[PDB]
Amino acid sequence: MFQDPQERPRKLPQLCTELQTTIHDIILECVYCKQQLLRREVYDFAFRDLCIVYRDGNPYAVCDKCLKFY
Amino acid sequence: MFQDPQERPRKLPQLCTELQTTIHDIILECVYCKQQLLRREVYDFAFRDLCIVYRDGNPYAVCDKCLKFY
Ligand SMILES: [Zn+2]
Ligand SMILES: [Zn+2]
Numbered sequence: 487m488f489q490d491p492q493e494r495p496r497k498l499p500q501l502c503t504e505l506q507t508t509i510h511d512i513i514l515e516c517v518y519c520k521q522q523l524l525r526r527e528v529y530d531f532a533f534r535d536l537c538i539v540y541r542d543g544n545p546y547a548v549c550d551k552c553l554k555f556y
Numbered sequence: 557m558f559q560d561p562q563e564r565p566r567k568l569p570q571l572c573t574e575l576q577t578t579i580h581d582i583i584l585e586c587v588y589c590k591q592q593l594l595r596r597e598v599y600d601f602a603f604r605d606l607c608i609v610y611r612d613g614n615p616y617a618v619c620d621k622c623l624k625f626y
Contacts, residue, residue: 510604526597526600527596529599529600529603532603
């Protein structure tokens with residue numbers, strides 16, 4: 487879960503800050519196929535221009551698969 | 557390998573500029589595995605606050621494989 491005092495950042499780096507962790511530890515899931523995004527590929531989110539997609543009420547990411555879909 | 561009059565810095569981004577290439581095209585080898593790092597691994601190296609380890613005279617790096625051990 488992610489509630490107060492956390493505000494649920496819309497940015498990957500900030501999301502890790504509120505979660506009290508690093509981008510190397512936080513593992514996000516795909517919003518489309520719901521697959522686990524490998525930490526190595528998670529860095530591509532910050533490397534390229536991608537925003538965090540919130541599915542229902544949780545922070546999700548776009549995998550290398552769905553990346554070309556949107 | 558790297559020789560004069562190249563400056564050969566310890567930072568990957570600067571090395572790319574000196575080599576007149578990009579981080580996507582630059583080829584780095586592992587100091588441990590002795591193999592060539594993958595494009596995804598090179599991105600990780602540039603994402604982390606790591607420096608290039610010069611061994612024997614060739615700019616070697618540390619892939620995610622050895623990186624998790626340290
Ligand atoms: Zn996906
Ligand atoms: Zn290695």
